[PDB]
Amino acid sequence: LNSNPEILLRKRRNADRTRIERQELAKKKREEQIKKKRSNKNK
RNA sequence: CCUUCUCAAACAUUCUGUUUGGUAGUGAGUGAUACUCUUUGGAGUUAACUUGAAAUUGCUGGCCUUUAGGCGAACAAUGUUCUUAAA
Numbered sequence: 591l592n593s594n595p596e597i598l599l600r601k602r603r604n605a606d607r608t609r610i611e612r613q614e615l616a617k618k619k620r621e622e623q624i625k626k627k628r629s630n631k632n633k
Numbered sequence: 634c635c636u637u638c639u640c641a642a643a644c645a646u647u648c649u650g651u652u653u654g655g656u657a658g659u660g661a662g663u664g665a666u667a668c669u670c671u672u673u674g675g676a677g678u679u680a681a682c683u684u685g686a687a688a689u690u691g692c693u694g695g696c697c698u699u700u701a702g703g704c705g706a707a708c709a710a711u712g713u714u715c716u717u718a719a720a
Contacts, residue, residue: 626720 627716630720
């Protein structure tokens with residue numbers, strides 16, 4: 591039926607949720623690093 | 634649980650020489666000979682000696698600028714501030 595062969599890449603699964611999770615993880619890591627940095631002045 | 638001002642000129646050629654400037658210390662304790670000044674209260678100097686980087690309380694020196702600094706610096710000057718020496 592007059593077709594043309596090609597290669598197709600399927601969409602990655604759960605990319606947006608992974609992106610949001612990574613953004614949240616980065617924010618949490620920054621915040622906890624700040625917490626521990628200013629918590630070490632009372633040693 | 635840091636690590637100490639390790640040099641600059643000017644003149645002259647005798648593979649170098651002369652001159653000038655640059656150096657603020659652990660504390661405590663013995664100990665004379667002498668000098669200068671003095672507000673006569675002690676202030677600055679002058680041999681030498683002891684020591685685990687030792688230790689049991691010296692009333693408060695003076696002038697200037699303040700809100701601790703200068704006298705070794707006057708329309709001059711003061712650390713708790715760097716944080717990958719992190720966790």
